[PDB]
Symmetry: C3
């Protein structure tokens, strides 16, 4: 199923009938960072399998829901259960939910993820406001926009110069200052590793020479689809470990340690994004 104007409209038609919510804000949370989706007020949970033209996620399994409701007086739509390209999903399957968000009226997309630190200033438990990215799949002919262009959503050759909104980064940093955890908040360039293997010690060493501050396996496809159709983006990475430090000390990297860091920071991140949603500018 192509993520075109007609197929995305069929999905939005179903969502509009099931919930009265017309959201202005979209949210995609990383694994273990989705507790905020539980406190959505007046919420409607729609499984992916019930939405027309939504991608099939049975092979991977686990949760896959679209949740719509209110947070701090704001109408939002949240993706519960993230689609990652290392699972084998095509460009069309990744793009359709974001373009359905666009047809529902989403103008701001807030994204969180887990990732590894490359810049020696980044430690486990730090946050990174993403101000730019280095897209290795895109350079190697695996860009999420490879294929025919859907002209109703955006241009054939998008400009990514301002994909990460400056004013949204300033707002997130100010809220961190107001609550005195600005000592955990950095800015940096995000490198897209397709995955699913963690970067080898020598791959981390290469990313250090290339100017990468953070490396992860997601986010960049969603940001490009959102920037393509004109949706503002705020992207925040939670640093689970510094792979340059781990290479020097021969310390292993595994998913159990990563999720433990997510649990250590889940509540603080939930409070942070709840206030960001509340403080998002109006018209």
């Amino acid at each position: 199923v192509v993520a075109n104007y007609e197929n995305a409209s069929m999905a939005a038609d179903y969502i509009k009938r099931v919930s009265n919510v017309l959201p202005d804000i979209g949210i995609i949370c990383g694994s273990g960072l989705g507790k905020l989706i539980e406190e959505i007020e007046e919420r409607k949970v729609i499984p992916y399998i019930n939405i027309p033209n939504f991608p099939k996620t049975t092979v991977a399994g686990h949760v896959g829901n679209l949740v719509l409701g209110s947070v701090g007086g704001r109408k939002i739509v949240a993706m519960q259960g993230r689609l990652h390209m290392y699972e084998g999903y095509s460009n069309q399957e990744i793009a359709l939910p974001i373009r359905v968000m666009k047809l529902l009226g989403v103008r701001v997309l807030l994204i969180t993820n887990l990732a590894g630190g490359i810049n020696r200033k980044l430690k486990s438990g730090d946050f990174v406001l993403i101000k730019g990215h280095i897209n290795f799949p895109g350079l190697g002919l695996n860009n999420v926009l490879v294929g025919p262009n859907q002209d109703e959503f955006g241009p054939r050759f998008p400009d990514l110069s301002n994909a990460y909104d400056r004013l949204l980064q300033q707002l997130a940093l100010k809220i961190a200052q107001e609550n005195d955890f600005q000592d955990l908040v950095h800015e940096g360039v995000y490198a897209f590793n397709g995955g699913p293997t963690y970067e080898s010690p020598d791959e981390s060493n290469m990313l250090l020479k290339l100017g990468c501050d953070v490396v992860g396996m997601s986010t960049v496809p969603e940001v490009i689809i959102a920037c393509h159709c004109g949706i503002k983006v705020l992207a925040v990475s939670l640093i689970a470990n510094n792979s340059i430090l781990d290479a020097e000390n021969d310390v292993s990297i595994n998913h159990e340690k990563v999720l433990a860091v997510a649990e250590k920071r889940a509540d603080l991140l939930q409070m942070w994004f709840k206030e960001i949603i509340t403080r998002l500018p109006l018209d």
Copy 2:
């Protein structure tokens, strides 16, 4: 349809019957740089959709023709309407027209494209004679030759050390000196970004560290297929903008500005390649 010896021969059989032209030179022009195809003498225009085994281009749309005729006393065949890999075409679809050119008797392939400047010495409106390339799709298992090797056309492991002919670069530079626009002609290494998104500011910064002078979204697949079967190549990039300058000044990159640069330089490039064709060495 595989771009094998049998399928390419079926296409060449049709072309040979429709036109008496046996071309020695092949031409592929970038968007907005194809006015020379309008001045082909005694020309025959063959739409792609009429040629057996030629790739289907209806989804992308727009012009797609094979034009055969004479330029300056030389017999040429021109591709009007370029096939780009960011559109979703497979390796086989890209390769077949060049291998059909080979079966028609083409020995020299002349290519132009639009691209962005990385080397700080490159300005908008400059020309770059490509003397080498850095193929990011090829390194990441998306090389145009990935798949079974068609032994009738070339070897399994081609050498790209001399893919860009030295004597053809010298000839193009001499013609520029004879007409006093050598101050616009540079040499450089071409980086292949799969596209279709323009390079982010940080991706341009990485390409500067990697030694890339120019970055674009085409040409390298055609050069590899041509070098595979023994066709000499001359490749010229027209610099639409310097993305390193644009990153420092936060200036946007879009296709409208790119085509305006192509229109600014179209006539000069048409005169240039008309003389290159005329001056190409004989046997």
Copy 3:
């Protein structure tokens, strides 16, 4: 055919019935480096086409056998006829034979390959014990593990920090010292170029800046599948040429010169790995 637990078991069932050999060691040899497969004692040769669920190799042609028997008192299984990803094989086709090796009881995998030298200390005819790798296909969303994870074999996010066993590298180096050819044995980082084109002179220059010592077109997919399911790996590259030297002197790179180097070093490499197999630690 997916390389899952059920399909690999069907292949192992057939292999177990055809040969009484329960191997503990697996071997994959590069082109021209497989003479050791001829001296397997009490050996059984099983063509790939006869094994259920084994990938189809008729399009590429040439030899494709699984050989099981004894070397120096050790029970081994050898892949005769290597599957390379530049041929067009999918992730599932590459992975299945290694996962069948795992189900047969293989705990150590020994791999050899031909490659080009980047580090200026590497000359033609040298050996390189691979201690790490830089996987460009993996970074660009062409990792061999992209797709659904087969949980019976390994985790979703594997750690590659110790994919190349330290103790196996020490053993191979000691045997080289015992026979006085340690002056040919180096250590280095292996870069994975998808192929099938040899690296351009500028691509070799980039790999020099990125810290790559060796570049080749294989091995890394097999190492990742083996590390995924817990198989120890020893990987040795034979340097056919130094492409940085060849770029400075404009010397061509072709497969005929590469195979001549393999023939020059075949017997020494056969003696080397025969002793490595004999000296592999017991329980």
